[PDB]
Design a binder for this molecule. Structure first.
Ligand SMILES: *[C@@H]1O[C@H](CO)[C@@H](O)[C@H](O)[C@H]1NC(C)=O
Lengths: 48, 48
Protein backbone atom coordinates (compact mmCIF):
# COMPACT_ATOMS: atom_id res chain seq x y z
CA UNK A 1 0.00 0.00 0.00
CA UNK A 2 2.69 2.51 0.97
CA UNK A 3 4.74 2.03 -2.20
CA UNK A 4 1.65 2.38 -4.41
CA UNK A 5 0.59 5.53 -2.56
CA UNK A 6 4.05 7.05 -2.95
CA UNK A 7 4.12 6.24 -6.67
CA UNK A 8 0.70 7.81 -7.22
CA UNK A 9 1.67 10.94 -5.29
CA UNK A 10 4.90 11.26 -7.28
CA UNK A 11 3.02 10.93 -10.58
CA UNK A 12 0.43 13.55 -9.61
CA UNK A 13 3.28 15.81 -8.53
CA UNK A 14 5.10 15.42 -11.84
CA UNK A 15 2.01 15.93 -14.01
CA UNK A 16 1.79 19.65 -13.16
CA UNK A 17 5.41 20.22 -14.17
CA UNK A 18 4.82 18.21 -17.35
CA UNK A 19 1.86 20.42 -18.26
CA UNK A 20 3.64 23.67 -17.36
CA UNK A 21 7.03 23.09 -19.00
CA UNK A 22 5.79 22.09 -22.46
CA UNK A 23 4.10 25.08 -24.18
CA UNK A 24 2.39 22.93 -26.86
CA UNK A 25 0.51 20.42 -24.70
CA UNK A 26 -2.79 22.36 -25.00
CA UNK A 27 -2.59 22.88 -28.75
CA UNK A 28 -6.10 21.67 -29.59
CA UNK A 29 -8.02 24.27 -27.60
CA UNK A 30 -5.66 27.01 -28.77
CA UNK A 31 -6.23 25.84 -32.35
CA UNK A 32 -9.99 26.15 -31.84
CA UNK A 33 -9.64 29.70 -30.51
CA UNK A 34 -7.23 30.70 -33.29
CA UNK A 35 -9.50 29.29 -35.99
CA UNK A 36 -12.48 31.29 -34.74
CA UNK A 37 -10.40 34.46 -34.48
CA UNK A 38 -8.98 34.00 -37.98
CA UNK A 39 -12.41 33.42 -39.52
CA UNK A 40 -13.86 36.54 -37.91
CA UNK A 41 -10.83 38.68 -38.81
CA UNK A 42 -10.98 37.53 -42.44
CA UNK A 43 -14.69 38.35 -42.62
CA UNK A 44 -13.89 41.82 -41.27
CA UNK A 45 -11.07 42.36 -43.78
CA UNK A 46 -13.24 41.35 -46.75
CA UNK A 47 -15.11 44.67 -46.38
CA UNK A 48 -12.16 46.52 -47.96
CA UNK B 1 -20.37 65.93 -28.97
CA UNK B 2 -21.30 62.80 -26.99
CA UNK B 3 -24.61 62.27 -28.84
CA UNK B 4 -24.60 60.22 -32.03
CA UNK B 5 -25.65 62.38 -34.99
CA UNK B 6 -25.12 62.61 -38.73
CA UNK B 7 -21.77 64.15 -39.64
CA UNK B 8 -20.56 65.48 -42.99
CA UNK B 9 -16.91 66.54 -42.87
CA UNK B 10 -15.52 67.85 -46.18
CA UNK B 11 -17.82 65.58 -48.17
CA UNK B 12 -17.25 62.54 -45.94
CA UNK B 13 -20.76 61.60 -44.81
CA UNK B 14 -21.58 59.22 -42.00
CA UNK B 15 -23.42 58.60 -38.75
CA UNK B 16 -22.16 58.13 -35.22
CA UNK B 17 -20.97 59.74 -32.02
CA UNK B 18 -17.95 62.05 -32.03
CA UNK B 19 -15.65 62.19 -29.02
CA UNK B 20 -12.45 64.06 -28.16
CA UNK B 21 -9.84 61.62 -29.42
CA UNK B 22 -6.54 60.83 -27.71
CA UNK B 23 -4.81 59.85 -30.96
CA UNK B 24 -1.48 61.52 -31.75
CA UNK B 25 -2.18 62.65 -35.29
CA UNK B 26 1.17 63.70 -36.70
CA UNK B 27 1.12 67.13 -38.37
CA UNK B 28 1.03 65.61 -41.87
CA UNK B 29 -1.91 63.30 -41.01
CA UNK B 30 -5.53 64.29 -41.70
CA UNK B 31 -7.77 61.28 -40.94
CA UNK B 32 -7.32 57.83 -39.45
CA UNK B 33 -8.53 54.34 -40.31
CA UNK B 34 -9.02 50.95 -38.69
CA UNK B 35 -8.30 47.34 -39.65
CA UNK B 36 -11.21 47.22 -42.13
CA UNK B 37 -10.36 50.40 -44.11
CA UNK B 38 -13.00 52.63 -42.52
CA UNK B 39 -12.67 56.08 -41.00
CA UNK B 40 -12.04 55.99 -37.24
CA UNK B 41 -10.83 59.51 -36.40
CA UNK B 42 -11.15 62.74 -38.37
CA UNK B 43 -9.69 66.25 -38.20
CA UNK B 44 -12.05 69.21 -38.10
CA UNK B 45 -12.12 72.12 -40.54
CA UNK B 46 -12.13 75.72 -39.34
CA UNK B 47 -10.60 75.09 -35.92
CA UNK B 48 -8.16 72.20 -35.86
C1 LIG C 1 -11.60 79.80 -40.33
O1 LIG C 1 -10.80 78.67 -40.73
C2 LIG C 1 -9.40 78.84 -40.47
C3 LIG C 1 -8.71 77.62 -41.03
O2 LIG C 1 -8.72 77.61 -42.45
C4 LIG C 1 -9.17 79.02 -38.97
O3 LIG C 1 -7.78 79.26 -38.74
C5 LIG C 1 -9.99 80.19 -38.45
O4 LIG C 1 -9.88 80.28 -37.03
C6 LIG C 1 -11.46 80.02 -38.83
N1 LIG C 1 -12.24 81.17 -38.40
C7 LIG C 1 -12.97 81.19 -37.28
C8 LIG C 1 -13.71 82.46 -36.99
O5 LIG C 1 -13.04 80.21 -36.54
Amino acid sequence: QKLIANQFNSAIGKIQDSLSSTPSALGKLQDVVNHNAQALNTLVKQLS
Amino acid sequence: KNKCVNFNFNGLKGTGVLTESNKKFLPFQQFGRDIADTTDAVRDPQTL
